[PDB]
């Protein structure tokens, strides 16, 4: 009765807005032509539904369990009627593939965070924003089994149900395959014609900034099924929309005796909104050629990177040269001539070494700033690990291995321990790492480029001594670095004023938006000043001196 | 009116603009002195200048682009759930600027939304204003909502709270 | 300025009491003013005061009645509305109709407090019962007022038979909200 | 409503080694040292069961402390069906369990000590704490335990002592004084040279080292801790470091002050560790929740902590005492039991100079390996 | 019958109580309903006064009577709010004699008791049940059962055929309420000597959740009940009212205080009133307490605003006393001994949850100190790995431990006050450069000074203006909270130019200092030190609530920095190290080892090279693998060219 009325209402709503019908038709046509596969899903905007009918909008927002399934059935009926497949297949006929729904638009007080989710928001549609910390393995889930009875020559089927698969509760169906027909004939399971869907459980953690002072972060579990199975990885920021639910007996059954613990609550995900390379167009290639023809482009590219920094122009040139690397030769004898440049910086304190590292990190396609001083997190080189109790061996890749065909920006190279020194020597010399520990034998490529900074041993660079003396690494390590740069902090009055003013500017620079200087606090997922840069005294600064050739008076805008 | 601090401040907000003329000597308007202002160039101007430039020109000097506080996102947010919307973050003078916008462009679509939002917010404003305290021995929600009040709403709330408090004090005075 | 900030475009409860006390009330005098000096007030009639006999009911302004009660020279006659039976009848009337307001006197809140404080032994009914009935009436009126605030518009509003104290309570909020809505509507045209 | 009767002086005294089957269900007096203790819990004193088939409610019973009440047949419905505990109206009693172990001295040469479990009912809980020597008079009971039978392989019964009275181990306490004695002390204090007599009367068996006697007497008597508006804290304890040639009557004086001091703990530099000086974590057999033990410094609060062969202690252990020396508190973080413990005790330490002898020419800095901070303290 | 009578009694109590002229509870209920607060707070004194029998019944069997009180409250609320809502919650206030936590025993089972303690841990909100919809597996019979939190419910075992436990819960038509578990520890004062603090589990529901945090003294009114986990039961408390020791009048008082013309001097006086001298350290500690205004940039590079200080002097200087006072005064503070704790104690450590066996992250002292101040003592004894961990933590204020099964990160916005023993390099000048301010405390041997300190200490022992020259800890703490949460001042353009000129003058001052021709000055100043000079002026501005920092703050900050860091940094040699290294290399052939003590005798005792030049050269040589340290550095072995 009510189910039919709601199905009819959603059918009328879909008829009114032709965009969703067009989207369904487009998905179906793309699937048919490509016979890589578009999922059966449609994204609706809550604003349009609110405009069309307030009752249905409020029902979806407050009573999703009773209002969502009718919408899914209406969409499935529309798709089936619109379908024009002439000849289906045994896989398609028996497949349990209804059409799912996802929601976009503006939420009211339902746009919450993992900390704000309390018991008053249960059985309601919510939008949770946070950070992924855990990601369980992808596993298949049984939702339909088709059997064959040879004697009667008929195909039977049976449907299963679980608390994490349907918004509306039903009697649990144990995963026991029927073995005999009602008439008594023996059945044989047809595995190829059954239906299995994927299943993944992830845990979303509150964003650290929003966490109240002196409070640990709170997390909420999320369940994703079918197409939304492999879309997030740990550490990513997501905005998951789903229905908050409570599962299990929660100690209410007489078997349990705690009588104090509460029920288990999760979210049934409906959609996930996330929170390298740029495809070159036809005229971008023309632009790059135009710049290439200009017989001054090397200086332009060199000084475009890190324009703020004063001096050290040769370092910028060498850093660009490193970024673009050199051809790598593979001889027929298996010999491998290295074709990746390496750079090491050594100098007194406060010479923008970290600034140069940051700029190469920002401009480099790949980079990992794993400092050499106790690199907690990702190790500098690969090293197997085992669990404390289960002893689960596993090869954990280090920074060097995670930069294949890229760059690794080590920091504070002078703080390395003997283990790291020995590992790095082999890594650079051979360009590959072969692990032969804990019964694990494997080879992992490490072709990359290394840039590192290293302060002196006495805290200040001595000119009278060789660079190999001001640094305390053996010749084996230093020889691997193709180019070694020694930089000293020189004091010049004009330079001092320039640096002072440039640093001062930022402090008085403010977060524009609220009373200047006071207590300081994506729209879509699917998705010629462009090339050149207008001069900015605040940022570039020294870049003008670069084209002026060390002349402050020079006003040659570069 | 003329001598009204709240009215004066509201006119001081920055609205987007698009110059469609080529005027020299107006460099200081954009960001630098002594540089002619090209045409078809976007810049941010205070309202007290943008309004006059738009009205006075055959062809106005300026063409006011759609502001950022009246975009479709804000309209949808207002229509969805007026009470929980935080107007203070959007703009501290939302209602005065809105009224000025409707008067300037005489748009009959924003008026309905603004009126409904004001009515719905006033319901909760009165709900919170009438809830006083009792010292029986001899607020968290109130503070949470109070931080989301525009300047005009804050003034109305203060006046209503003072009236209610005075009446209660007189009524229960010994 | 010449007038405080809170007294602009509204009233104060003390002024409301001042207004309420300007009305007549019936009292039982305890002296014999009638002859066989004398009052010559200018704002109020002085004939009644000059002609009063003990235990014989007469009419005088509420302010003068309270002044006499201060010296214990008269006994105030509690109005007919204040009695319990009338209060139960009015409560039932309010409950029966969830849309209209009762028809109590406009000064049914100020007079109640003034009499409950100054004259606590003149009533013919228990004081606590009267206080409870008045509280119930006030609560029902508050509910109805809250429900009726959802119909503010830019044209006008009607609140038949609403006491002066409640109107004074609601004057700032209603007036300001209606003014803002009217300004928006006028700008729209 | 109940006044328990406790027997004080049982003539027959037994030990944890000589208890046999003949002593079952009889009054026995044993001596031992407490090495374990559990929290205080309420235990049912009169239970009232009910049925599940008919729902009938059984009458009152008495709950023995060692075995739980078992019913295998009803009386109202007279069926062997399941049962349950009901009758929310009940009267409870306190219940605690401690592990009593034989005194190390009493144990014959190099034999394993024998331990039993003692059950303390209402009015007896929190009457003793770990590390005490006590005498327990109670009923030596036994009961059937399935786990023991399954493990050993023979019909063996668990045994436990239901305590009836606990006493500490002349009289009851020498430190306790009477009103009559308090008058004697005032008379003695009036002596003109009482201080000299106190110093002389301290370690008389040792001839010389009057400076040692003065310092140690001052440490024993102690100071007056002071606090200023809760903003400034001044320690009242006095710390004395003893340093000199090998044979000088150093350890013997510490042994003497151990006896004389009210609450004293004796630890040697070699035989000590930070875990044993701060606290140790155990698992409660009842609640299965991790608790925290007391350390050597904690056990000697408001007393004296004597350390012998101080120079021999390792650096980490010597750092563990820095906190107690000046901060007068020890901080612990183990097994999510982060808390701060109170340790206000004076420390008397004895050591020999580095190299085995004190070179009078060189200063105290090089003579002993202790760092400048601790030396200053 | 009886239940209806009790409900009517409660209704009459609520509707009839009145002290002078105002119906307290009626008006309170109306006000609470208006703001969507479904609760009622009742003072037990009023209940006793109105009718003693009602209180007698309430205290006799609270678990049975309290739900009826909630029902009556709900009925009255519906009568008062709806013209002819969830079950309301009852909160109780009482003034009965407090029962010590350690003294709770079986005698107080199922009785209302009042106690006090300190919260040590709080859980995350659970979801208890209040109205369950149940359907039978076989015959599919729909039914509903209501549940009340108080115990003196489980799914039916017999269907209302169907076997045991035939009912399942329909979760789409049920209602739930919040629950939380807290732990209460007895007050330190009441703990008997030689014993240990005892803990007690507690439970709160609905509007009593998220009302306290660990480390807050609280007073609890609740039911002492027992829940089954020989025949023993686990005690616990059911909370009914929370009153923790933690407006406009105080704003007026604070504003008047800020108007005092010597606010800076009084605040510097309140810092350690009991410690004599060390005025510069006192001012630096004041600046650290107030801190610096936060800076955030749209690009992503947000500058630090907090302040850290280093106290490095000889023993007997009251550094620890200063740290203790700083810990006590600040609203949020953690006092930690460097050697007492470890890497786990500070920053954070990755551990595993025993109950669930999942790798999780637990914060250290800095995490627990987020938004406050951490006073680290004995910086020297702390291990080098912990020191570098602290280096990173102060560098980014976000301890980055996100690996090993999880990828979670925590914020550590904190101010570090470090007291370190004298160096007499492990204490390399780099970590010092990280510190904003460096102080070397040295008492000068002036007879007047010695007598003054002696008199001060004797006055301490034999022993409070607080009349315009000092303020107690409570007022100062509230002051710090107000100033840190309200005002975030910023410097001024003229002050900015003046400070730039000041740095120029400092560089020129070194230029004057370097009268030497060949010798090179170590450092005039670093850019990090320049940033350090700023953010203390904002501290002074926030101290006085000044929206813009004027030149006065600039000169004050300049003097404070000059009196601490430049002199301490200043408080040839490399060429000598070259000769020492050459001699050591020449003396020892390859493979020949000589005792480090023997080398010290050869050179240090001979005085040809000072000891500070021995360790430096030895470290420089060892780090290059040319030499090796053996026997804890007591034997030196050459290992190549
Ligand atoms: N050429 C330069 N132009 C502008 N600023 C500079 C230049 N060289 C150094 N700086 C300033 O030096 C400051 C210090 O930079 P950074 O902390 O990265 O120094 P570092 O020498 O790499 O440090 P460390 O000695 O600790 O390894 C930066 O704020 C930058 O402003
Ligand atoms: N002044 C003295 N009078 C009496 N006996 C003394 C005296 N000095 C030393 N002795 C005796 O010297 C012996 C030395 O043993 P004791 O336990 O006293 O310390 P120790 O082993 O010499 O000390 P250390 O730990 O410094 O090696 C003891 O028997 C003590 O009786
Ligand atoms: N001016 C002073 N007024 C009072 N006490 C002072 C003063 N200067 C030093 N002190 C001393 O400081 C002591 C407490 O601080 P403490 O000496 O432990 O600090 P510290 O020097 O850091 O210690 P250590 O270096 O030994 O670890 C008090 O006992 C005390 O009398
Ligand atoms: Mg650096
Ligand atoms: Mg000895
Ligand atoms: Mg100290
Ligand atoms: Zn039975
Ligand atoms: Zn059934």
Curated annotation (Swiss-Prot), chain A:
Q: What GO biological process, any one, is recorded here? A: DNA strand elongation involved in DNA replication
**Catalytic activity, as annotated:** ATP + H2O = ADP + phosphate + H(+)
Subunit structure as annotated in this protein's UniProt entry: Component of the MCM2-7 complex. The complex forms a toroidal hexameric ring with the proposed subunit order MCM2-MCM6-MCM4-MCM7-MCM3-MCM5; loaded onto DNA, forms a head-head double hexamer. Interacts with CSM1.
* UniProt similarity note: Belongs to the MCM family.
Gene from which the chain derives: MCM3
- Function as written in the Swiss-Prot or TrEMBL entry: Acts as a component of the MCM2-7 complex (MCM complex) which is the putative replicative helicase essential for 'once per cell cycle' DNA replication initiation and elongation in eukaryotic cells. The active ATPase sites in the MCM2-7 ring are formed through the interaction surfaces of two neighboring subunits such that a critical structure of a conserved arginine finger motif is provided in trans relative to the ATP-binding site of the Walker A box of the adjacent subunit. The six ATPase active sites, however, are likely to contribute differentially to the complex helicase activity.
Instruction: State its Enzyme Commission number(s).
Output: 3.6.4.12
Keywords, ordered alphabetically = ATP-binding, DNA replication, DNA-binding, Helicase, Hydrolase, Nucleotide-binding, Nucleus, Phosphoprotein
User: Which residues belong to any copy of the MCM domain?
Assistant: 297-504
Has keyword DNA-binding? yes
Organism for this UniProt entry? Saccharomyces cerevisiae (strain ATCC 204508 / S288c) (Baker's yeast)
The molecule here is called DNA replication licensing factor MCM3
Q: Which residues bind ATP?
A: 347-354
Example of a GO cellular component annotation carried by this entry: nucleoplasm
Query: Motif span (Arginine finger)?
Result: 479-482
Region of the whole protein represented: 19 to 648 of 971
Q: Where in the cell is it found?
A: Nucleus
From Swiss-Prot, chain B:
**Per UniProt, what is one Pfam family of this protein?**
Sld5
Record-level GO cellular component terms: CMG complex; DNA replication preinitiation complex; GINS complex; nuclear replication fork; nucleus
Family matches, as InterPro entries: GINS_A, GINS_bundle-like_dom_sf, GINS_Psf3, GINS_Psf3_sf, PSF3_N
CDD domains (UniProt xref): GINS_A_psf3, GINS_B_Psf3
**A biological process (GO) annotation for this entry?**
double-strand break repair via break-induced replication
Gene3D superfamilies according to UniProt: 1.20.58.2050
Q: Where in the cell is it found?
A: Nucleus
Q: Which UniProt keywords apply?
A: DNA replication, Nucleus
Record keyword Nucleus present: yes
Question: Does this entry carry the keyword Transferase?
Answer: no
- Major location, coarse class? nucleus
Its quaternary organisation is:
Component of the GINS complex which is a heterotetramer of SLD5, PSF1, PSF2 and PSF3.
**Protein role:** Functions as part of the GINS complex which plays an essential role in the initiation of DNA replication by binding to DNA replication origins and facilitating the assembly of the DNA replication machinery.
Q: What else is known?
A: Present with 2205 molecules/cell in log phase SD medium.
What does the sequence similarity comment in the record state about its family? Belongs to the GINS3/PSF3 family.
The name this protein carries in UniProt is DNA replication complex GINS protein PSF3
Q: Which gene encodes it?
A: PSF3
Curated annotation (Swiss-Prot), chain C:
**Which of UniProt's keywords are assigned here?**
DNA replication, Nucleus
What does it do? Functions as part of the GINS complex which plays an essential role in the initiation of DNA replication by binding to DNA replication origins and facilitating the assembly of the DNA replication machinery.
Q: Which GO terms describe its biological process?
A: DNA-templated DNA replication; double-strand break repair via break-induced replication
The cellular location(s) given in this protein's UniProt record come to:
Nucleus
Q: Which InterPro entries match?
A: GINS_A, GINS_bundle-like_dom_sf, GINS_Psf2, PSF2_N
Q: What is this protein called?
A: DNA replication complex GINS protein PSF2
Q: What is its main location?
A: nucleus
Is Lipid biosynthesis included in the keywords of this UniProt record? no
SUBUNIT field = Component of the GINS complex which is a heterotetramer of SLD5, PSF1, PSF2 and PSF3. Interacts with PSF1 and SLD5.
Keyword rRNA-binding carried by entry: no
Q: Which GO terms describe its cellular component?
A: CMG complex; DNA replication preinitiation complex; GINS complex; nuclear replication fork; nucleus
Q: So what family is this one in?
A: Belongs to the GINS2/PSF2 family.
UniProtKB/Swiss-Prot annotation, chain D:
- Per UniProt, the C4-type Zn-finger stretches lie at 51-77
Localization (cell): Nucleus
Entry binding sites for ATP: 244-251
Q: What is the effect of changing residue 77 to Y/F/S/H?
A: Loss of activity
Q: Give start and end of each MCM domain.
A: 194-377
Q: What domain of life does the UniProt record list for this protein's source?
A: Eukaryota
Q: In which family does this protein belong, per the annotation?
A: Belongs to the MCM family.
Any extra remark in the record? Present with 1690 molecules/cell in log phase SD medium.
General function of this protein:
Acts as a component of the MCM2-7 complex (MCM complex) which is the putative replicative helicase essential for 'once per cell cycle' DNA replication initiation and elongation in eukaryotic cells. The active ATPase sites in the MCM2-7 ring are formed through the interaction surfaces of two neighboring subunits such that a critical structure of a conserved arginine finger motif is provided in trans relative to the ATP-binding site of the Walker A box of the adjacent subunit.
Q: How does it assemble?
A: Component of the MCM2-7 complex. The complex forms a toroidal hexameric ring with the proposed subunit order MCM2-MCM6-MCM4-MCM7-MCM3-MCM5; loaded onto DNA, forms a head-head double hexamer.
Q: What is this protein called?
A: DNA replication licensing factor MCM2
Species: Saccharomyces cerevisiae (strain ATCC 204508 / S288c)
Provide the gene name from the record.
MCM2
């Amino acid at each position: 009765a009510v189910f039919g009325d709601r199905v009819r209402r959603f059918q009328e709503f879909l008829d009114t807005f032709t965009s969703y019908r067009d989207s369904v038709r487009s998905i179906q046509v793309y699937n048919s032509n490509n016979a890589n596969i578009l999922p059966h899903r449609i994204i609706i905007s809550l604003d349009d539904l609110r405009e069309f009918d307030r009752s249905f909008w409020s029902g979806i927002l407050v009573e999703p369990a009773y209002f969502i399934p009718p919408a899914e059935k209406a969409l499935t009926d529309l798709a089936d009627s619109m379908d024009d497949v002439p000849h289906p297949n045994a896989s398609a006929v028996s497949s349990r593939h209804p059409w799912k729904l996802s929601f976009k638009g503006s939420f009211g007080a339902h746009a919450l965070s993992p900390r704000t989710l309390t018991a008053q928001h249960l059985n309601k549609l919510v939008s949770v924003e946070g950070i992924v910390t855990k990601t369980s393995l992808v596993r298949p889930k049984l939702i339909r089994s088709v059997h064959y009875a040879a004697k009667t020559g008929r195909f039977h089927y049976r449907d299963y149900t679980d608390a994490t698969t349907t918004l509306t509760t039903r009697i649990p169906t144990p995963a026991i395959y029927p073995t005999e027909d009602t008439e008594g004939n023996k059945l044989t399971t047809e595995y190829g014609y059954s239906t299995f869907i994927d299943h993944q459980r992830i845990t979303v953690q509150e964003m650290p900034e929003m966490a109240p002072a002196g409070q640990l972060p709170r997390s909420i579990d999320v369940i994703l099924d079918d197409d939304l199975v492999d879309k997030t990885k740990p550490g990513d920021r997501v905005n998951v929309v789903g229905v908050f639910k409570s599962l299990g007996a929660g100690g209410m059954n007489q078997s349990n005796s705690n009588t104090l613990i509460g029920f288990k609550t999760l979210i049934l995900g409906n959609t996930v909104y996330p929170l390298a390379r740029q495809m070159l167009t036809d005229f971008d290639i023309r632009n790059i050629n135009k710049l290439s023809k200009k017989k001054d482009i090397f200086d332009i590219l060199s000084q475009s990177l890190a324009p703020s920094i004063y001096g050290h122009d040769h370092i910028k040139k060498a850093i660009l040269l490193m970024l673009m690397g050199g051809v790598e030769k593979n001889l027929e004898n298996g010999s491998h001539l290295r074709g990746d440049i390496n750079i090491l910086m050594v100098g007194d304190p406060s010479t923008a070494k970290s600034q140069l590292l940051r700029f190469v990190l920002n401009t480099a396609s790949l980079a990992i700033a794993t400092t050499g001083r106790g690199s907690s997190g990702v190790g500098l080189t690969a090293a197997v690990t085992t669990d404390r109790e289960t002893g689960e061996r596993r090869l954990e890749a280090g920074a060097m291995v995670l930069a294949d065909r890229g760059v690794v920006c080590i920091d504070e190279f002078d703080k390395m321990t003997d283990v790291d020194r020995v590992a790095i020597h082999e890594v650079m010399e051979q360009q590959t790492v072969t692990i032969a520990k804990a019964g694990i034998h494997t080879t992992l490529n490490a072709r990359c480029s290394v840039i590192a900074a290293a302060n002196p041993v006495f805290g200040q660079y001595d000119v009278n001594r060789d660079p190999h003396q001001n640094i305390a690494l053996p010749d084996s390590l230093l020889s691997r670095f193709d180019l070694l740069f020694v930089v000293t902090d020189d004091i010049n009055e004009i330079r001092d004023r320039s640096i002072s003013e440039h640093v001062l500017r930022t402090h008085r620079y403010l977060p524009p938006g609220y009373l200047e200087g006071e207590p300081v606090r994506s729209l879509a997922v699917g998705e010629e000043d462009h090339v050149f840069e207008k001069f900015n005294p605040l940022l570039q600064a020294g870049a003008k001196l670069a084209k002026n050739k060390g002349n402050y008076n020079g006003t040659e805008i570069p | 009116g003329y001598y009204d601090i709240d009215d004066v401040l509201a006119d001081g907000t920055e609205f987007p603009c698009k110059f469609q003329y080529d005027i020299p000597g107006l460099g200081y308007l954009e960001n630098n002195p002594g540089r002619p202002i090209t045409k078809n160039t976007k810049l941010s101007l205070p309202l007290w200048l943008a309004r006059i430039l738009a009205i006075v020109g055959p062809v106005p000097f300026v063409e006011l682009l759609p502001p950022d506080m009246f975009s479709t996102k804000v309209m949808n947010a207002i229509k969805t759930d007026p009470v929980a919307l935080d107007l203070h973050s959007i703009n501290s003078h939302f209602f005065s600027l809105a009224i000025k916008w409707i008067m300037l462009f005489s748009e009959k679509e924003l008026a309905n939304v603004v009126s409904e939002l004001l009515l719905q917010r006033a319901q909760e404003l009165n709900h919170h204003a009438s809830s006083l305290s009792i010292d029986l021995n001899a607020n968290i929600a109130t503070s949470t909502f109070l931080l989301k009040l525009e300047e005009m709403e804050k003034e109305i709330y203060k006046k209503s709270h003072e009236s209610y408090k005075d009446t209660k004090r007189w009524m229960f005075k010994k | 300025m010449s007038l405080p900030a809170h007294l602009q475009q509204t009233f104060s409860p003390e002024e409301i009491q001042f207004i309420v006390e300007n009305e007549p009330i019936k009292i039982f005098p305890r002296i014999t003013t009638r002859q066989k000096t004398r009052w010559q007030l200018i704002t109020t009639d002085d004939k009644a005061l000059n002609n009063m006999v003990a235990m014989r009911s007469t009419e005088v302004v509420l302010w003068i009645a309270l002044l006499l009660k201060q010296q214990s020279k008269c006994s105030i006659v509690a109005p007919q509305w204040l009695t319990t039976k009338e209060l139960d009848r009015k409560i039932q009337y309010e409950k029966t109709h969830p849309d209209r307001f009762s028809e109590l006197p406009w000064n049914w809140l100020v007079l109640a407090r003034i009499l409950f404080n100054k004259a606590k032994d003149d009533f013919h009914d228990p004081i606590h019962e009267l206080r409870g009935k008045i509280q119930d009436l006030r609560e029902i009126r508050q509910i109805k007022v809250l429900k009726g605030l959802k119909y503010l518009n830019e044209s006008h509003l009607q609140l038949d038979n609403l006491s002066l104290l409640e109107i004074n309570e609601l004057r700032p909020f209603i007036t300001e909200i209606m003014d803002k809505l009217r300004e928006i509507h006028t700008a729209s045209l | 409503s109940e006044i328990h009767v406790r027997i004080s002086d049982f003539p027959t005294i037994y030990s944890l080694r000589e208890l046999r089957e003949s002593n079952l269900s009889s009054l026995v007096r044993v001596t031992g040292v407490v090495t374990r203790r559990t929290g205080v819990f309420p235990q049912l004193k009169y239970v009232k069961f009910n049925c599940l088939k008919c729902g009938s409610i059984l009458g009152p019973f008495f709950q023995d402390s060692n075995e739980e009440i078992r019913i295998s047949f009803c009386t109202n419905c007279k069926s062997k069906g399941p049962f349950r505990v009901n009758g929310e109206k009940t009267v409870y009693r306190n219940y605690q369990r401690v592990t009593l172990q034989e005194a190390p001295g009493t144990v014959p040469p190099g034999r394993l000590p024998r331990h039993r479990e003692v059950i303390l009912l209402a009015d007896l809980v929190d009457v003793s704490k770990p590390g005490e020597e006590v005498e327990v008079t109670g009923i030596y009971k036994n009961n059937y335990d399935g786990n023991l039978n399954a493990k050993n392989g023979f019909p063996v019964f668990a045994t436990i002592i239901e305590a009836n009275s606990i006493k500490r181990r002349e009289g009851l306490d020498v430190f306790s004084w009477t009103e009559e004695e308090e008058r004697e002390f005032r008379k003695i204090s009036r002596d003109r040279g009482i201080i000299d007599k106190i110093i002389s009367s301290m370690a008389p068996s040792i001839y010389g080292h009057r400076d040692i006697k003065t310092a140690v007497a001052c440490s024993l008597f102690g100071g007056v801790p002071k606090n200023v508006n809760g903003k400034h804290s001044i320690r009242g304890d006095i710390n004395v470091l003893l340093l000199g040639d090998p044979g000088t009557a150093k350890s013997q004086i510490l042994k003497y002050v151990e006896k004389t001091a009210h609450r004293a703990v004796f630890a040697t530099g070699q035989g000590a560790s930070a875990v044993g000086l701060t606290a140790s974590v155990r698992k409660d057999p009842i609640t299965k929740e991790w608790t925290l033990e007391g350390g050597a410094l904690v056990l000697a609060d408001k007393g004296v902590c004597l350390i012998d062969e101080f120079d021999k202690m390792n650096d980490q252990d010597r750092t563990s005492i820095h906190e107690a020396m000046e901060q007068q508190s020890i901080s612990i973080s183990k097994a999510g039991i982060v808390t701060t413990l109170q340790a206000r005790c004076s420390i008397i330490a004895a050591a020999n100079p580095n190299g085995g002898r004190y070179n009078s020419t060189l200063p105290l800095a090089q003579n002993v390996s202790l760092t400048e901070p601790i030396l200053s303290r | 019958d009886d239940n209806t009578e009790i409900i009517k009694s409660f209704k009459n109590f609520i509707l009839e109580f009145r002290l002078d002229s105002q119906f307290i509870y009626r008006d309170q209920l109306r006000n609470n309903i208006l703001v969507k607060n479904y609760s009622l707070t009742v003072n037990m004194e009023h209940l006793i006064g109105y009718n003693e029998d009602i209180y007698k019944k309430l205290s006799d069997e609270p678990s049975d009577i309290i739900p009826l009180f909630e029902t009556a409250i709900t009925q009255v609320a519906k009568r008062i709010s709806i013209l002819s809502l969830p079950t309301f919650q009852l909160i109780l206030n009482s003034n009965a004699n407090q029962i010590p936590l350690r003294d709770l025993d079986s005698e107080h089972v199922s009785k209302i008791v009042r106690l006090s303690g300190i919260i040590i841990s709080t859980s995350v909100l659970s979801s208890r049940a209040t109205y369950l919809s149940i359907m039978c597996r076989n015959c599919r019979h729909t039914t509903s059962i209501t549940i009340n939190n108080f115990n003196s419910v489980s799914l039916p075992r017999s269907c209302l055929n169907c076997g045991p436990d035939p009912y399942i819960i329909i979760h789409e038509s049920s209602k739930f309420i919040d629950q939380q578990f807290l732990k209460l520890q007895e007050i330190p004062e009441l703990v008997p000597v030689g014993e240990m603090p005892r803990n007690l589990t507690m439970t709160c529901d609905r509007y009593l959740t998220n009302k306290v945090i660990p480390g807050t003294r609280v007073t609890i009114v609740g039911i002492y009940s027992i829940y089954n986990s020989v025949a023993i039961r686990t005690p616990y408390i059911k909370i009914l009212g929370i009153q923790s020791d933690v407006t406009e009048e105080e704003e007026e008082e604070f504003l008047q205080l800020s108007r005092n013309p010597k606010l800076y001097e009084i605040l510097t006086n309140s810092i350690a009133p009991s410690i004599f001298g060390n005025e510069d350290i006192k001012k630096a500690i004041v600046c650290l307490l107030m801190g610096g205004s936060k800076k955030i940039l749209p690009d992503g590079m947000r500058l630090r605003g907090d302040i850290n200080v280093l106290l490095l002097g000889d023993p007997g200087t009251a550094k620890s006393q200063l740290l203790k006072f700083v810990e006590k005064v600040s609203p949020i503070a953690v006092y930690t001994s460097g050697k007492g704790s470890s890497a786990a104690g500070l920053t954070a450590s990755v551990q595993r949850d025993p109950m669930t066996r999942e790798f999780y992250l637990e914060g250290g002292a800095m995490v627990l100190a987020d938004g406050g101040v951490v006073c680290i003592d004995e910086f020297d004894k702390m291990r080098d790995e912990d020191r570098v961990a602290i280096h990173e933590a102060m560098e980014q204020q976000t301890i980055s431990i996100a690996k090993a099964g999880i990828t979670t990160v925590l914020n550590s916005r904190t101010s570090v006050l470090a007291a370190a023993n004298p160096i007499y390099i492990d204490f390399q000048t780099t970590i010092l450069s990280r510190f904003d301010m460096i102080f070397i405390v040295k008492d000068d041997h002036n007879e007047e000074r010695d007598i003054s300190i002696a008199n001060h200490v004797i006055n301490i022992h034999t022993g409070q203006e607080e009349n315009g020259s000092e303020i107690s800890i409570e007022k100062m703490k509230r002051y710090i909270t107000y100033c840190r949460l309200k005002c975030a001042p910023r410097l001024s353009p003229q002050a900015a130019e003046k400070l730039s000129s000041n740095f120029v003058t400092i560089r020129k001052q070194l230029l004057i200092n370097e009268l030497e021709s060949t010798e090179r000055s170590s450092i005039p100043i670093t850019i990090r030190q320049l940033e350090a000079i700023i953010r203390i002026t904002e501290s002074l501005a926030k101290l006085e609530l000044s929206p813009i920092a004027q030149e006065r703050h600039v000169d004050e900050a300049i003097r404070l920095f000059q009196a601490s860091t430049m002199d301490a940094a200043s408080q040839t040699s490399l060429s000598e190290i070259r000769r020492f290294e050459q001699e050591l290399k020449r003396r020892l052939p390859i493979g020949w080892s000589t005792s480090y003590q023997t080398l010290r005798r050869e050179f240090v005792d001979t005085h040809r090279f000072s000891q500070l030049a021995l360790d430096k050269a030895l470290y420089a040589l060892e780090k290059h693998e040319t030499i090796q340290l053996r026997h804890q550095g007591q034997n030196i072995y050459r290992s190549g060219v």
